[PDB]
């Protein structure tokens, strides 16, 4: 639907989507590789 | 002096104080074609008579607020309201409208006072007019 796509592309929905994507990236990288104080 | 027939009101505590009989008060008079209800700017609602009405208030702003209410909040509008200042000595000065025509519209016989001939950005610098007791707009 045209209106559905337009609503999905509004600012709050998009920023929430990007934020949750980045949060997932960080969460997974920290689950698999925890306690990274520096690059040895 | 002035006319009479005050509107039918039960009174309130938001009316005149000592200043009214010591410094000044204000009067507003108007002729209404029906005996109806209006809102008193001092709290509460009052019934204004059919015919001429006179009302005493403490501030000019209250009189003009009542005038605005009369002009806008009635289907048969009121255009003949008059506002006077009543001094404690009984001297009455007719304030509004000044010439009888409303100030919102252009009319001959006015003096055009308070007008500067320059833009607001061409005012003199404050430092140049120091020790003159005048701000840049005053010159």
């Amino acid at each position: 639907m045209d209106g559905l796509k337009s609503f999905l592309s509004t600012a709050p929905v998009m920023i929430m989507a990007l934020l949750t994507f980045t949060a997932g990236i960080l969460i997974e990288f920290n689950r698999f590789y925890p306690d990274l104080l520096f690059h040895p | 002096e002035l006319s009479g027939q005050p509107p039918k009101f039960g009174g309130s505590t938001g009316g005149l104080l000592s200043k009214a009989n010591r410094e000044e008060k204000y009067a507003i008079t108007w002729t209404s074609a029906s005996e109806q209800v209006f809102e008193m700017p001092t709290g509460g609602a009052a019934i204004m008579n059919e015919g001429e009405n006179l009302l005493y208030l403490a501030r000019k702003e209250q009189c003009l607020a009542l005038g605005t209410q009369l002009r806008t909040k009635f289907k048969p509008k009121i255009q003949d309201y008059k506002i006077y200042r009543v001094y404690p000595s009984g001297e009455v000065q007719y304030l509004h409208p000044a010439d009888g025509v409303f100030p919102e519209k252009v009319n001959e016989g006015r003096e055009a006072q308070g007008t500067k001939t320059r833009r607001i950005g061409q005012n003199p610098e404050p430092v140049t007019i120091k020790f003159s007791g005048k701000a840049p707009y005053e010159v």
Binding site: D2, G3, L4, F7, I27, N30 | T13, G43, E61
Partner: protein, 741 residues
Amino acid sequence: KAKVSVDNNPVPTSFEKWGKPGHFDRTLARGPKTTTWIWNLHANAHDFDSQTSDLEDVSRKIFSAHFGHLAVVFVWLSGMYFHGAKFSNYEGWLADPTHIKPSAQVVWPIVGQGILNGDVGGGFHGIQITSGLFYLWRASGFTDSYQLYCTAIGGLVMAALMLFAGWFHYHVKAPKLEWFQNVESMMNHHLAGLLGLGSLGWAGHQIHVSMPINKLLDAGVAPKDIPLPHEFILEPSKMAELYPSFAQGLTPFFTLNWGVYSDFLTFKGGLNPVTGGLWLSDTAHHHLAIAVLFIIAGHMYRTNWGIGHSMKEILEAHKGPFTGEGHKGLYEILTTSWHAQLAINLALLGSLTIIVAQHMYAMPPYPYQAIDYATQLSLFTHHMWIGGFLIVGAGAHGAIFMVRDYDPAKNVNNLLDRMLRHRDAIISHLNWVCIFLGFHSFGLYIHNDTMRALGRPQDMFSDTAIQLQPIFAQWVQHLHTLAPGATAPNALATASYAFGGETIAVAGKVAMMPITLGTADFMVHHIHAFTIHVTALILLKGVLYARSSRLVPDKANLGFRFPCDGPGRGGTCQVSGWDHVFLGLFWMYNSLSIVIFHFSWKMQSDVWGTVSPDGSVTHVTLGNFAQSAITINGWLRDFLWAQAANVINSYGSALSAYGIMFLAGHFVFAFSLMFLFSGRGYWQELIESIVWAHNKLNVAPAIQPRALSIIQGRAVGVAHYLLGGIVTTWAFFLARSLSIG
């Protein structure tokens, strides 16, 4: 053959307007020109009165939105039920409730937050919960996780039904305005069909399900040997051997031989010695009597058969000499203005929530609740905060009504007019009483502080000094203690042991013991009175002076929510009703904070504690309230400093999340002062410079940024301030009460 009247398909179901934000408002529909357009979008959203002038359309919108909030609440409830069914130790706690802490939140181990999954006993690791859901569920006869899961599924289904109901009753079949104005029919149905029927059904559930299960549980039966609840229906013999009167059947009810039911419909009072809660038979007769009363009351107003009173007649007929037209004209006020209804309902519901909080701790209904100090404190504070917010909203929306829906022509010499006509007297006398209360009450504290500081303890206002005995409350406590004797002959024990009597203790912890009142309690109660009268002063001045005032005679034309009339008249900042609400929020916060501090310290010092087998009681803070709570230094050292040892030292344990939160609370508070102490001109100039910076690199946005408006700045400041303070208090109370029992 019904009063129903609706319109069919008034609003099409289309998706296009979802893609055009701000569609509701004429101004916002022109897209964003500055950033303020964004903020006005989120704020003007659910204000339908300004959006349209058709009262029927506004009413339909309100009805649908109420369906929406019902759906949201149902989703929340189903979430609680599911998270108690799957991620909790409810079945484990149900076996040894005096040795297992409740727990229904489990944390994923990702970055070390697995330390939060602390040991709650019985080999379960998770967050200890304080909402008291376990005691509520046990009081409901819950014994299996499958039943809780089914309850969650039912909640989800009900939420879906409410959402569909909103969509249908708005977008398809919307009731007409005359349907909404059936206040008589609405009151009849909601008093009898909602309150009375609900309480009757709950009493039926309590008698037929909850009471036998709890009776079996209190006798030592294992939670799995107890039959399923429907087995008491399919096999009525077991119900008849738990209660002999069930053998008698339904005959005594219809023959009015009700005495035989007294084995399971009692008037015991007091508390259950085993579970620490009220007897379920007492709640059974209680909800049953309440149901009967509400069903009777719902048959009062005439709807379609001429039998019954008429609200307008009663309103116009109750008028006296002092009041002119009296209560006349109020029916049209309350049947045409939504905001007046909202104000009345908000005030009443806030007071109701405060009463809930105040009555729910002295008479702990649920089993094993009074023994769980953290749950008591949490429930008390939570519902009191809810009540305070509701009352402030009552004031706000009353001012909104006065600005918007008021009409002078319909209120000539009625009660509203005469209120508006002696308002200076009201505000002056109320201001005087506020000053008097503040002076005498708080100066008592300051005087005590100074006398203690100077080494003059005999000049203080203490129990070993000049005494201020609340003899009236002492007398009422003495009376309420004597009630089981003669004044209420058919009662076994007092309504609550707070008034007096024996000390009820479950396990080793005191469940409820008498709460004496002395000099300190006198001072704190009068402090409460002072703060409440001051909050009432602020809100009442906001409501009464909304239309106009001596300073501004045409405040009504400026609207309800405007910042100022300018620097004229010496300065006219914060003259609207909105600013009055904004100022009243802080005072509500102050009053409720003092109230909850009083409750916490008094309970810790005189009620809660442990019991030795000899019979002596050791309180949590060793009864220091009666001597330290009479000075501000006492409230600082012996309460805020002494009781914060449990929260500051929470790092490295399962309570660390509170300590963090504690500090978080101390931060946002300070943050809010950026908005309360400043003004938007400075920020506008700073934004001008920053916009120059972004312009130099050709990166300036099309939507020109703007500093927040004055009203928005005040709102942001008050919101962040309240959030920070309340979060601080919540973290403090939870960390303190999870370390003493």
